[PDB]
Design an enzyme around this catalytic site. Structure first.
Site, PDB file in Angstrom:
ATOM      1  N   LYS B  36       0.862  -1.171   0.000  1.00  0.00           N
ATOM      2  CA  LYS B  36       0.000   0.000   0.000  1.00  0.00           C
ATOM      3  C   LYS B  36       0.903   1.227   0.000  1.00  0.00           C
ATOM      4  CE  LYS B  36      -3.649   2.441   2.396  1.00  0.00           C
ATOM      5  NZ  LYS B  36      -4.788   2.301   3.343  1.00  0.00           N
ATOM      6  N   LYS B 135     -17.534  -2.541   9.832  1.00  0.00           N
ATOM      7  CA  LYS B 135     -18.677  -2.671   8.913  1.00  0.00           C
ATOM      8  C   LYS B 135     -18.354  -3.795   7.968  1.00  0.00           C
ATOM      9  CE  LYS B 135     -16.798   1.106   6.171  1.00  0.00           C
ATOM     10  NZ  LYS B 135     -17.071   2.456   5.550  1.00  0.00           N
ATOM     11  N   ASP B 155      -8.447  -2.369   7.569  1.00  0.00           N
ATOM     12  CA  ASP B 155      -8.644  -0.916   7.456  1.00  0.00           C
ATOM     13  C   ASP B 155      -8.618  -0.172   8.774  1.00  0.00           C
ATOM     14  OD1 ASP B 155      -9.161   1.765   6.862  1.00  0.00           O
ATOM     15  OD2 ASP B 155     -10.704   1.289   5.365  1.00  0.00           O
TER      16      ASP B 155
END
Ligand SMILES: NS(=O)(=O)c1cccc(-c2nnn[nH]2)c1
Lengths: 271, 267
Positions: B36, B135, B155
């Protein structure tokens, strides 16, 4: 290596995991204060300061260029410390200077208050909340000159205040967020304006408006906005001065005067 | 070190806030990872890039975490323009997509996946880390083509360490500071309630027709169990959800209590 570039001298003071020493830059001979901040080793530790909090402070300091605020000259890091090379402020606390006097007039006081407001106006224009404005962080550059210059110091808990929408966007949508997030009311620039009201109160009167017998009592007094303008303290203070303070010591942050309003206030506009 | 000297870079996998993710392979081991690349904010820039503070906050969280149900950080590099995180490669996609593909899903099967989420959160909370963005889209599977897939929470972009606070005089501090109530680990527990409600029913408890309606519904804790959508759901499961969707954070189940609840513990 900082010692290759600055000659280190006496300890000047110490605070939260930091020790401040006087120094002199090799080559230029200019004098500075070197603030040695102890780095936290493991994220689980409660000793030292986390890298992210050091960075938060350094990022704010980097931005600052105003005569009433301390400035950052240089930065180093060794194995155990981040060393900030800061403007050397040698005039001591404003209130200690005022203590050398037999008395102080409202006009003499407002000279200094205007400087504090100008510094805060600059900070707020960059969306920087200081969050610990108090007399100990209001210093003088040099106390022996005719018109001493205020320097605001110690950005250890200062934060940039983002726009309200910058918070909400990070979640994508609100579907999974808790009620405390939905109702989140961030701390803002208004907190500094309250502090200014308290500073003004004490500057004019010598009395602390909310101080109780214990810290807990002081906190209760603050939350209740439990203060007055007793004549034993305020008999030689103008009504406009009191009005200025009243418009800052407001429980609801959204009803408090902003720094722009503070500077437009008739008491301040008069000089 | 430069990342390219140690890793072979491959195809782009995804994007984040001023970030690109690429598949990569470690030289010397042949093992695959996700790299990333996070663009650093220049000192002369206002809004482009990610601030150093925010990069450090997330990295310090990732550096701490090792647990089977959480994404692992393998390596970090930094060059002129980017900070590069070498992360565990999570290839199995979203949990909820995998579940949606099952012919049938029993309540007992659902609880087994939920328990893995609880295990990850138990670990995070033990380190005083609030995820703050739990979520479905952040609940992935490591490998979907195995008999019992392993959940990976991903995340950590808004995750924070969680912790009166005033060491000096309180005399100048504003009432909103004196009365400050920081966001805490309880927020994750609320999210788990919402996730569980959707997991069992396919309906979302608070979602309204507009944003303001959704916000209003959350704040009032205005939800119910529709008779149709919950007709095959146990009272024991409904109890679990009820004990999470509570307005006062102090009265919600903690992660420990959630793992002790009979809906989880009975299995
Ligand atoms: N020298 S001092 O004790 O007044 C002291 C202690 C801790 C921090 C500072 C400081 N921080 N930023 N600017 N001055 C000063």
């Amino acid at each position: 290596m900082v010692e290759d570039h600055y000659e280190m001298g006496e300890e000047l003071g110490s605070g939260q995991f930091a020790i401040v020493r006087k120094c002199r830059q090799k080559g230029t001979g200019k004098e500075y204060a070197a603030k040695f901040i102890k780095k936290r080793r493991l994220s689980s530790s409660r000793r030292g300061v986390s890298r992210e909090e050091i960075e938060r402070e350094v990022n704010i300091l980097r931005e600052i260029r105003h005569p009433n605020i301390i400035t950052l000259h240089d930065i180093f890091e060794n194995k155990t410390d981040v060393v900030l090379i800061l403007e050397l402020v040698s005039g001591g606390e404003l209130f200690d200077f005022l203590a050398e006097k037999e008395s102080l007039t409202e006009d003499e006081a407002t000279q200094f208050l205007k400087q504090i407001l100008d510094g805060v106006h600059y900070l707020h224009s960059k969306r920087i909340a200081h969050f610990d404005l108090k007399p100990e962080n209001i210093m003088l550059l040099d106390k022996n000159v005719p018109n001493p210059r205020i320097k605001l110091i110690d950005f250890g808990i200062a934060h940039k205040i983002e726009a309200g929408n910058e918070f909400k966007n990070i979640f994508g949508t609100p579907e999974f967020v808790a009620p405390e997030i939905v109702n989140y009311e961030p701390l803002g620039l208004e907190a500094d304006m309250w502090s200014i009201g308290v500073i003004t109160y004490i500057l004019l009167s010598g009395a602390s408006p909310f101080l109780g017998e214990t810290k807990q009592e002081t906190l209760t007094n603050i939350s209740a906005v439990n203060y007055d303008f007793d004549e034993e303290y305020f008999s030689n203070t103008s009504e406009l001065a009191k009005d200025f303070i009243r418009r800052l010591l407001v429980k609801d942050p959204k009803r408090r005067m902003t720094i722009a309003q503070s500077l437009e206030h008739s008491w301040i506009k008069a000089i």
